[PDB]
């Protein structure tokens, strides 16, 4: 999230926690949208999936820590 | 917004009204996204600021009318 | 590219052919830009990689056919 | 260029030098395009101006150093 998108670690951890805790998509969307363009880029990257759905998959494959780094 | 981005006056002035009303970033992002590629380009332009933050700064300097025209 | 981004197969497969041929990033950016907002969204998705770098990585993992479909 | 767009200082200085030396727009466009999305964002930010034309103005107003920082 940092390397690819430039999402600060404190914002990214929050986002992933919300994902892992089955939080509202709209929550994830406001946090990510507030980060500015790096967050907009990560929103764009999901495509037509929900961001929650997308990031869930991403943690499933690389684990929390690597998703924060990415 | 018209000259540089191709955002019809009716859309833009609504976007600016939401800015000046201290409305949600996501709302601005959804209106701009809905205009299509001229709105994605304005989103991209804001870089790592929120689009609200960005448009607020633009209105501060040129004032609402010039920002609509731009 | 179709499923997630809405990029017609005729455009996408050309974009991928340019990737695989080691063509200019700007060329990829101009084709994608020309498709309109689905192409801006794919541009945004790549984050801080070049789009060439990004699509190369996608083809490596899903292979050209799935990347067209995606 | 750094604060707003996340353009590394070595790439940004090069770009501004090219601008100040009346270099080709296509040169500026390939460098900026290669930076990835922060460069695409700065390209989007010019709007319908040429990037050279846009950055020329930007240095005129803030001077080289501040344009690198921005
Ligand atoms: C570099 C800055 C990026 C701006 C230019 C490139 C395109 C990126 C612009 C934003 O892309 C996203 O598009 C979607 C539309 O599909 C938009 O929707 C978000 O909010 C919806 C809430 O109603 C939600 O359902 C979507 O999951 C979510 O992606 C998104 O916010 C944009 O960032
Ligand atoms: C966050 C990543 C941004 C991607 C999504 C948001 C929109 C930004 C996509 C790129 O925007 C620019 O659009 C222009 C088209 O007006 C495109 O043209 C560039 O190259 C032309 C060369 O033929 C040149 O004449 C233009 O001056 C120049 O801006 C640009 O490369 C895109 O980055």
The kinds of small molecule bound in this structure are:
a molecule of 3 linked components (GLC-GLC-D10)
Structural Rg of chain A: 10 Å
Query: What is the class of chain A in the CATH system?
Result: Mainly Alpha
Largest sheet of chain A: none
Spell out the CATH superfamily of chain A: Bacteriocin AS-48
Distance between the termini of chain A: 4 Å
Query: Largest interface by residue count?
Result: A-C, 13 and 12 residues
CATH topology (level 3) name of chain A: Bacteriocin As-48, Chain A
Number of helices of chain A: 5
Shape of chain A: globular
**Helix percent band of chain A:** over 70%
Question: What class, by secondary structure content of chain A?
Answer: mainly alpha
Q: Please identify, by name, the CATH architecture of chain A.
A: Up-down Bundle
Q: In percent terms, what proportion of residues of chain A is strand?
A: under 5%
Quaternary organization? homotetramer
Number of structural domains of chain A = 1
Q: What's the total number of strands of chain A?
A: 0
Main location (chains A, B, C, D): secreted
Protein name (chains A, B, C, D): AS-48 protein
Organism (chains A, B, C, D): Enterococcus faecalis
GO cellular component, one term (chains A, B, C, D): extracellular region
């Amino acid at each position: 999230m940092a390397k690819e998108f430039g999402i600060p670690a404190a914002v990214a951890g929050t986002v992933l926690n919300v994902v892992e805790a089955g939080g509202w998509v709209t929550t994830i969307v406001s946090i990510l949208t507030a980060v500015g363009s790096g967050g907009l880029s990560l929103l764009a990257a999901a495509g037509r999936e929900s961001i929650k759905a997308y990031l869930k998959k991403e943690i499933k494959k690389k684990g929390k820590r690597a998703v924060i780094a990415w």
